[PDB]
Design a protein around this ligand. Structure first.
Ligand SMILES: [Cl-]
Ligand SMILES: [Cl-]
Length: 129
């Protein structure tokens, strides 16, 4: 599913992400934009052979099981394919664990490089919510 911007903001809000660990809704929307272009089916292989999955490109090295990432964990206790669903519940629940792990949204390198220090509120500007 490719979310609209305001549609994704609203789904994230409903799942308790606006201001989760202090990170306003625009932070999450912006991260999603640059991680997946709002496509729940996005997958990308990493150099290390781990894979990033879904709207927030959650990585198989620590967070989900895909069966092909040697020496990995599955700290969200989820198959990585659950992160590709049209329903973002699994991605949001697992993002909450990630952003609580000590480095906040710096866990997302694309958030650090493309969202952090920007007018992230622009990502939810105009949205009803
Ligand atoms: Cl915001
Ligand atoms: Cl933080």
């Amino acid at each position: 599913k490719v979310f609209g911007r305001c549609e994704l903001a609203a789904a994230m809000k409903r799942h308790g992400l606006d201001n989760y660990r202090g990170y306003s809704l625009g932070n999450w929307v912006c991260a999603a934009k640059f991680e997946s272009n709002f496509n729940t089916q996005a997958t990308n292989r990493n150099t290390d052979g781990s894979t990033d999955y879904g709207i927030l490109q959650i990585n198989s090295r620590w967070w989900c099981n895909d069966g092909r990432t040697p020496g990995s964990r599955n700290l969200c206790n989820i198959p990585c394919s659950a992160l590709l669903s049209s329903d973002i519940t699994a991605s949001v629940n697992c993002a909450k664990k990630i952003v609580s792990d000590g480095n906040g949204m710096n866990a997302w390198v694309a958030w650090r490089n493309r969202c952090k220090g920007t007018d992230v509120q622009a990502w939810i500007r105009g949205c009803r919510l």
